[PDB]
Design a protein around this nucleic acid. Structure first.
Lengths: 739, 250, 701
RNA sequence: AGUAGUAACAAGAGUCUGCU
């Protein structure tokens, strides 16, 4: 009797037990080493799906650029990047005719939000390729480096503090024939280690002012940094994602804001929606495509993926789309929204970290970078990398490959959704006036397509019309991973619809473990995570109860805070048992103090200190909620009384790098922190609400200090000697400011 | 009272880099350099807490904890040690010190702890005195609506209770905004009359008045009651194929 | 104009004017009238404010005192409003609607100073109608000399007023000698352009028939569709089509499983061939410490022999493994304390791989090495399916005598849905706790937790990690089981994929010579003899020790510590079955789902056909499937599941009479069979899909 | 050797260990 779980599908339907087809309990696949190979794979695939385009040499970067659009039509079912401009413009014009006032209201809201957007909006989101350091930094760090390099040169429009003046400075900085940057350099010494007694190389990373050229600065400003996407499910082989820079991020924000304004008013778009909103949209399109009139109206549904979605959409098609949507609009708005497709059409790809090479006689290994991969013989590579470098050698410009056609993963998701929705919108009944008509739903690349007709030959004609119209605009439907059946069961972005019943499996189920901040924060975050997965992601009640039990078990293990009546004897169990013995009401001790678990399904929305407050001892609640506690940081007025518990402590932080001295580059973060602390000394509401002002920090602080001295003098709360001391200190600070 | 902070600013202006950063960066640019983080990040903070709690001193505390708790416990546990030649305002602390403080620390008064978190105690009062009904299993069709996750105050919208709060606790930094409602001055007078004998930071009573007065709306999938006292128990009252009939206390 | 202002005034007035013009969005190089007007307003306000003091008594002295006027003009609007709010909160006066220029502490008055080019009276009436409704004092100057304040009342001395009048008249006369006074009285949107570098970038990002960005932009804006889509569809080849091939599972083939050598065991511990030395109610004065419980479980086994290599690891040095076991047993014999760190001998250095990495240098020193070849990147060698993994999954779905999961307590159940969820959860936990998969969860959690703690505290130590689990009997007696030992290597883990090498030494009663392809990476010794008491007879069976070099990552240990999400996922599957039932039957269908004491669910395939089982067998099989997904996690399994989900949904679309169809079925089969290379669990899943396909084919004739 | 899989780790830039 050999056991087979798939025979469970003999009794229950597949959509009722589809969760067995998601092996999401083990570790997802990770990439080891560099991502140069996946980058060169993407470059070669993008230039091979477009190879019948026109080759030009960029007058500004010197990079070879391939232009596939308005080229020869495809002759086979391979992925092709020959999108037609007139067909794209016809589809956008038909989308405008179908939705009157959509483009006008979306462009109006985009103009309303351009003039009311700070530079701080670029401090939010994912990490950014810092062109100063040739690495990836966080968003605020790379933005501060960009603003510092701009204002050390003659570009200070960003002192206005709004995004469009920063973008004006970005476009103005391309004229600088010698940009002055502050790059991290490295000194190397050889030191014997005192523990292992081995000769290591101590690296001291400092700073150094370098002078880029116009060409080098433009190559760095057009660079997308590529790296391998790790921890991705559902795939056998890895792929490369890319991060943009700082010169392109605000323009991409404005274009994606426009396209987000478009896609919210479209019924056939699955972006930007949530967990149950997508289910309601699936039910809406199945409802609207099941209005039978005659005796037999056939209705079929394609569950469709697209093959090589980002490799085939050109930025010039996005330029034509963003110039057609912004029609009848001011020219500053059209140019500002058109900058980002121009930057993506002239873009370049940083090829990762290089490759590891190995000498088997000297028994050494060396990581040689992607810039060093040009002046090295082809005999030292393996076969795949030699083929890659032979195919990519004509595209290299100063360590980077020119990726002029195609996009990268996750740059314009909503604009590509707009193009797919325009293809879906072509197939209405009295627009086509045909024997078939299609509706459906469009994500970034996934789609569901309902085609109604009178005969199955009309269904086939509609599938062929949709497929060839997609091939006209550079969209390639995956024939291997799409299928078609009658309407009633389908799949859209791991949502499985069967006769009304929708199964959501778009999100991986979390571990429901400890978050890792402190004790009270992890308790609150864990109960909130269980509650939000119950509300949004269809988590069943018994699974949520077992999730509470697994979270309490992992929480009690991690912080070593098992109950007082337990037989486990950890490092903290003696003090916890001493607290357990002298406590009268044991139900009021927190879980971090050895108390019982109060939580269930009904009180997940209530914090633990509030939940056990009536059960606490008076002495225990006085000690736990003592406002003079030494674990939480106190801010001065003497300091204020704390209103947090003693379990909101701070873990010991460690950001050290092996054999790396980086105190020469870590000083500026501490200086920025001290400046923000003394500004919050002078202004009590700089951390409750963000302060505004084009004046300097020192000017604002001195202007506050003089007027507070004068008000305290005129109210009698200060003497004239302290007033004169404050005013003489402000005069001395102003004299050192001007000198 | 105004002299030590300006002498600290003078000692910062005597440093050249701090003077250049204070003179060049503006008040609108210090929201960008407030998050300037430079260093090697961590990718698994959960695993970091796992292997860091197994060490003896994972907690980082101040120097005042050298004089508030002893060095050794009653059982022989070292509650705190020093750092490697760092006599700063920061030492390392075992969670045995936290359990020590919770079992044998100084008892105080906690009378302001319910009134800061009065919203959560109100939620607990509605849940403790609520009455449940029979569960009904059917096909639950939840519609995404903009609902009120925080009801706020009457006669105050979301852009006006914030101005009341900016008047009450940070009055010299309101800017050009004035009180344009008759209820605003009464609420402002009452909140300033309450918050006078309080040694709690103004940010904490600002967030207290924010969760008392500022209304918050959110798109949520609801099939049933869309009131504010039903949005908070959405996890308890409905699911994919059932419906828990509930009546909150009040 | 511009040059007269810099040749004329003080640098303070110019600095204030440049700050105001940079704030408001102007520049001195573009406007000459507005720059000189802002400088004139600032100069009049500064001459109004300066040389006015209030002494310690209160009288205005004009020359250690304080000033009389607080300047609000020229300060930035946030700074000026901060000053205004601080003054208005010091006194009782309400705030003005707009920003004033000065504040007089003596009269306590907001002074507004407006200097025009026209007559004093008209500009005064304009500013009086504008600043109306508040007690803001006004004071209007001009270049003619006349003034008109609020109701012709003046708080300032006549000498300072005459001095400012003389300064303004001298300024008018200097502009008259400069000839710029004529265009001064007559002086009373968004832009985003392309610089030439970005213009030449924009002229190269077009469709190829265009050469200018504005030409293409005018083409896009003046575009009208005239059937271009149909004209391109008629001109495209007919070979670009999506032909719908009809899908029928009776006509499709099975998955092409690979060939070659048999798939070997690659789990980090022994699953069904692991025996345990157990102690019942341990009170050996360590009681929880892993090495103390390891010695307490090692003391319950007499019958150690001289160890001998009985099955060799074919690619290694088996004498090193023999010496590793001898050194480990001798160091356990002589250990002191709570932790055991082995002396780094040469056989332990071979078995843990110390010295096998080449010394990583930087490229700038190693440019002159001739034989510097790239790291080779070969695909995995394919392997054939063997019966041992099916036997392992058969054993993992069975019941034990021990209770292997201890859940923490909840709050009390008050809501009726909490009672329903507790009934469902207790049914699943009663059916699933005594399973072998729960024992594997316990083993993986303990091994990965202990390996992570030892890897992140003792990085330069060869630390002995005993494989310990704990359980409860049917009577609630605690039992502590020992399965073997893990000797940890050097773990300086920086990446998430950096490997710490370890050595596993696991006790067993299973002879490795019966299935020798399974134990490829192992070197099995014969360490003892055990008097095994069967039901009637008592046999003397040899106790083997499986010794191998393995390795793990920080990501793998992190996911092994989180192994109770297998119990979460299996309960989620069973609960989604119950929820999809109750969404149609409209009642709590939990009780007619677990109290089915008949066999209703097909879960097996005997030679007599397809076998059915109860719901508890199904929940144990779903738990075992999640556990084996966690143990043998790979990219092959991920790709295979994601690709064969489509074929499962196609078979379901056929069974629902929904007329399924495909576009490239051979490509789907190639995408499925590309992810089946050498992992035993993905090979068993491929065989499982083939068995399910044959079952659903024979179900429909 | 082993982990592993399209390229890497197998060290020298990324005083601690107790889950019934």
């Amino acid at each position: 009797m050999d056991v087979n779980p798939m025979l469970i599908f003999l009794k229950v339907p597949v959509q009722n037990a589809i969760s067995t087809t998601f092996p999401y309990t083990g570790d997802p696949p990770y990439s080891h080493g560099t991502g140069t190979g996946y980058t060169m794979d993407t470059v070669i695939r993008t230039h091979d799906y477009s190879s019948r385009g026109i080759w030009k040499t960029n007058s500004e970067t010197g990079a070879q650029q391939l232009n596939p659009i308005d080229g020869p039509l495809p002759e086979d079912n391979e992925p092709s990047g020959y999108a037609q401009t007139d067909c794209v413009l016809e589809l956008i014009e038909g989308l405008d005719r179908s939705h009157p006032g959509l483009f006008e209201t979306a462009c109006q809201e985009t103009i309303d939000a351009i003039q009311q957007t700070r530079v701080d909006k670029l401090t939010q989101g994912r990490q950014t390729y810092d062109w100063t350091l040739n690495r990836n930094q966080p968003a605020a760090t790379a933005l501060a480096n960009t603003i510092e390099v701009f204002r050390k040169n003659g570009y200070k429009l960003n002192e206005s503090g709004r995004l469009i003046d920063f973008l004006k400075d970005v476009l103005l900085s391309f004229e600088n024939d010698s940009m002055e940057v502050t790059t991290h350099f490295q000194k190397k010494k050889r030191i014997r280690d005192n523990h292992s007694k081995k000769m290591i190389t101590q690296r001291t990373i400092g700073k150094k002012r370098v002078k880029l050229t116009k060409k080098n600065y433009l190559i760095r400003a057009l660079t997308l940094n590529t790296m391998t996407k790790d921890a991705e499910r559902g795939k056998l082989k890895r792929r490369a994602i890319a991060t943009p820079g700082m010169q392109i991020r605000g323009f991409v924000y404005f274009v994606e804001l426009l396209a987000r304004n478009i896609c919210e008013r479209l019924e056939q778009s699955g972006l930007p929606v949530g967990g149950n909103e997508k289910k309601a949209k699936l039910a809406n399109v199945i409802k609207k495509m099941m209005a039978k009139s005659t005796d037999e109206e056939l209705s079929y549904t394609i569950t469709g993926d697209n093959t090589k979605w980002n490799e085939n959409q050109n930025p010039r098609i996005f330029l034509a789309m963003v110039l057609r949507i912004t029609a009848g609009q001011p020219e500053w708005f059209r140019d500002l929204l058109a900058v980002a497709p121009i930057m993506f059409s002239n873009k370049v790809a940083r090829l990762g970290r290089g490759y590891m090479f190995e000498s088997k006689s000297m028994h050494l290994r060396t990581q040689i970078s992607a810039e060093n991969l040009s002046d090295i013989n082809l005999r030292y590579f393996n076969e795949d990398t030699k083929k890659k470098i032979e195919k990519i050698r004509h595209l290299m410009v100063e360590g980077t490959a020119s990726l002029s056609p195609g996009m990268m993963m996750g740059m314009f998701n909503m604009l590509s959704t707009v193009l797919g929705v325009s293809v879906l919108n072509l197939g209405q009944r009295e627009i086509l006036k045909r024997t078939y008509w299609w509706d459906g739903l469009q994500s970034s690349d996934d789609f569901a397509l309902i085609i109604n007709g009178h005969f199955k030959e009309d269904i086939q004609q509609g599938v062929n019309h949709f497929y060839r119209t997609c091939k006209l605009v550079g969209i390639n439907m995956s024939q291997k991973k799409s299928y078609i059946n009658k309407t009633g069961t389908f799949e859209f972005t791991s949502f499985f619809y069967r006769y009304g019943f929708v199964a959501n499996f778009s999100m991986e189920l979390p571990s429901f473990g400890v978050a890792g901040n402190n004790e009270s924060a992890d308790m609150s975050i864990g109960t909130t995570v269980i509650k939000t997965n119950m509300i949004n992601n269809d988590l069943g009640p018994a699974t949520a109860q077992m999730a509470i039990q697994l979270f309490i078990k992992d929480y009690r293990y991690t912080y070593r805070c098992h109950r007082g009546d337990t037989n486990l004897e950890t490092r903290r169990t003696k003090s916890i048992k001493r607290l357990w013995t002298e406590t009268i009401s044991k139900a009021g001790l927190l879980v971090a103090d050895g108390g019982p678990n109060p939580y269930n399904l009904r009180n997940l929305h209530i914090p633990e200190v509030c939940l056990k407050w009536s059960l606490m001892d008076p002495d225990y609640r006085g000690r736990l909620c003592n406002p003079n506690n030494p674990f939480v940081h106190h801010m001065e007025v003497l300091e204020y009384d704390a209103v947090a518990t003693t379990h909101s402590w701070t873990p010991k932080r460690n950001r050290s790098i092996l054999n790396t001295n980086q105190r020469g580059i870590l000083e500026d973060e501490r200086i920025y922190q001290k400046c923000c602390q003394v500004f919050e000394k002078f202004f009590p509401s700089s951390t409750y609400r963000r302060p505004i002002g084009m004046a300097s920090m020192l000017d604002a602080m001195l202007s506050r200090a003089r007027i507070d001295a004068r008000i305290d003098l005129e109210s009698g709360r200060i003497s004239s000697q302290d007033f004169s001391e404050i005013t003489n200190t402000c005069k001395a600070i102003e004299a050192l400011k001007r000198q | 009272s105004g002299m030590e902070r300006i002498k600290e600013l003078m000692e910062m202006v005597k440093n050249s880099r701090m003077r250049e950063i204070l003179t060049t960066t503006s008040v609108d640019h210090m929201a960008v350099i407030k998050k300037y983080t430079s260093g090697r990040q961590e990718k698994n903070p959960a695993l970091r807490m796992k292997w860091m709690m197994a060490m003896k001193y994972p907690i980082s505390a101040s120097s005042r904890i050298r004089e508030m708790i002893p060095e050794k416990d009653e059982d022989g546990n070292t509650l705190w040690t020093n750092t490697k030649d760092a006599g700063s305002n920061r030492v390392l602390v075992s969670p045995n010190a936290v359990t020590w403080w919770n079992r044998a620390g100084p008892v105080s008064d906690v009378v302001h702890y319910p009134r800061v978190y009065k919203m959560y105690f109100d939620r607990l009062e509605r849940l403790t005195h609520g009455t449940f009904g029979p569960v009904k299993f059917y096909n639950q069709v939840k519609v995404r609506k903009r609902v009120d996750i925080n009801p706020g105050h009457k006669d105050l919208t979301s852009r006006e209770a914030q101005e009341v709060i900016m008047e009450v606790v940070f009055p010299n930094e309101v800017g050009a905004r004035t009180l344009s409602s008759d209820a605003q001055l009464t609420i402002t007078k009452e909140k300033k009359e309450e918050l006078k004998n309080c040694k709690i930071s103004p940010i904490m009573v600002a967030y207290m008045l924010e969760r008392e007065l500022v209304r918050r709306t959110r798109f949520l999938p609801i099939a049933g009651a869309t009131s504010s006292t039903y949005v908070e128990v959405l996890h308890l009252t409905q699911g994919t194929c059932w419906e828990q009939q509930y009546t909150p206390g009040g | 104009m511009e040059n007269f202002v810099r040749t004329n005034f003080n640098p303070m007035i110019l600095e204030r004017a440049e700050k105001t013009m940079k704030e408001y969005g102007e520049n001195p190089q573009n406007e000459g009238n507005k720059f000189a007007a802002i400088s004139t307003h600032m100069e009049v306000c500064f001459m109004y404010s300066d040389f006015h003091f209030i002494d310690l008594e209160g009288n205005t002295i004009v020359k250690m005192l304080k000033h009389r006027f607080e300047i609000i003009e020229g300060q930035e609007r946030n700074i000026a409003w901060t000053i205004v709010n601080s003054i208005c909160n010091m006194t009782e006066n309400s705030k003005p609607r707009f920003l004033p220029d000065l504040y007089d502490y003596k009269t306590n008055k907001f002074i507004e100073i407006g200097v025009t080019r026209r007559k004093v009276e008209d500009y005064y009436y304009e500013k009086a109608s504008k600043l109306k409704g508040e007690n803001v004092y006004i004071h209007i100057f001009s270049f003619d000399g006349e003034e008109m304040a609020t109701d012709d009342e003046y708080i300032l001395d006549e000498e300072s007023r005459a001095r400012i009048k003389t300064r303004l008249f001298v300024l008018r006369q200097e502009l008259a000698t400069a000839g710029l006074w004529d265009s001064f009285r007559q002086s009373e949107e968004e832009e985003f352009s392309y610089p030439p570098t970005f213009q030449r970038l924009a002229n190269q990002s077009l469709p190829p028939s265009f050469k200018d960005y504005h030409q293409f932009k005018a083409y896009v804006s003046s575009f009208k569709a005239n059937g271009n889509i149909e004209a391109k569809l008629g001109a495209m080849s007919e070979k670009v089509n999506a032909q719908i091939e009809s899908f029928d599972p009776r006509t499709i083939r099975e998955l092409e499983l690979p060939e070659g050598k048999f798939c070997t065991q690659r789990s980090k511990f022994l699953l069904m061939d692991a025996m345990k030395l157990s102690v019942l109610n341990p009170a050996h004065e360590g009681e929880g410490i892993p090495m103390k419980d390891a010695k307490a479980c090692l003391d319950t086994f007499w019958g150690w022999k001289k160890a001998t290599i009985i099955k060799k690891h074919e690619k290694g040095v088996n004498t090193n493994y023999l010496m590793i076991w001898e050194q480990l047993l001798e160091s356990i014999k002589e250990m002191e304390g709570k932790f055991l760190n082995l002396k780094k001998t040469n056989h332990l250095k071979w078995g843990l791989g110390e010295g096998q990495a080449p010394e990583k240098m930087d490229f700038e020193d190693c440019k002159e090495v001739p034989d510097l070849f790239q790291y080779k990147s070969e695909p995995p060698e394919k392997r054939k399916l063997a019966s041992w993994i099916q036997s392992e999954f058969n054993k993992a779905s069975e019941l034990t005598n021990s209770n292997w999961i201890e859940f923490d307590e909840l709050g009390n159940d008050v809501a009726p849905i909490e009672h329903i969820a507790s009934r469902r959860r207790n049914f699943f936990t009663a059916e699933v706790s005594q399973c072998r998969a729960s024992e594997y969860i316990m083993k993986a959690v303990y091994i990965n937790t202990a390996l992570l703690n030892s890897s992140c505290t003792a990085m330069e130590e060869y630390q002995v990690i005993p494989i310990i689990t704990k359980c409860r009997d049917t009577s609630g007696q605690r039992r502590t089981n020992l399965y073997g030992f893990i000797i940890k290597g050097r773990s300086h883990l920086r990446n998430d994929t950096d490997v710490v090498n370890f050595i596993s030494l696991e006790f067993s009663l299973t002879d490795p010579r019966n299935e020798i392809h399974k134990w490829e990476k192992y070197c099995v010794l014969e360490i003892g003899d055990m008097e095994i008491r069967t039901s009637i007879s008592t046999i003397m069976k040899p106790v083997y020790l499986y010794v191998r070099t393995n390795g793990t990552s920080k990501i793998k240990m992190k996911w092994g510590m989180e192994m109770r999400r297998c119990l979460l996922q299996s309960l989620q599957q069973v609960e989604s079955m119950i929820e999809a039932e109750s969404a149609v039957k409209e009642k709590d269908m939990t009780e007619p789902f677990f109290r089915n004491r008949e066999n209703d669910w097909p879960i097996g395939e005997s030679p007599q056909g397809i076998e059915k089982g109860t719901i508890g067998k199904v929940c144990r099989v779903l738990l075992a499937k999640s556990v084996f997904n966690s143990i043998y996690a790979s990219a092959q399994l991920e790709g295979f599941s994601a690709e064969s989900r489509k074929l499962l949904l196609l078979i379901q679309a056929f069974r629902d009479n929904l007329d399924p169809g495909t576009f490239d079925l051979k490509g789907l089969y190639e995408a499925i069979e590309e992810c089946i290379i050498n992992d035993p669990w993905v090979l068993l899943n491929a065989s499982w899909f083939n068995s399910f396909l044959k079952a659903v084919q024979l179900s429909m004739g």
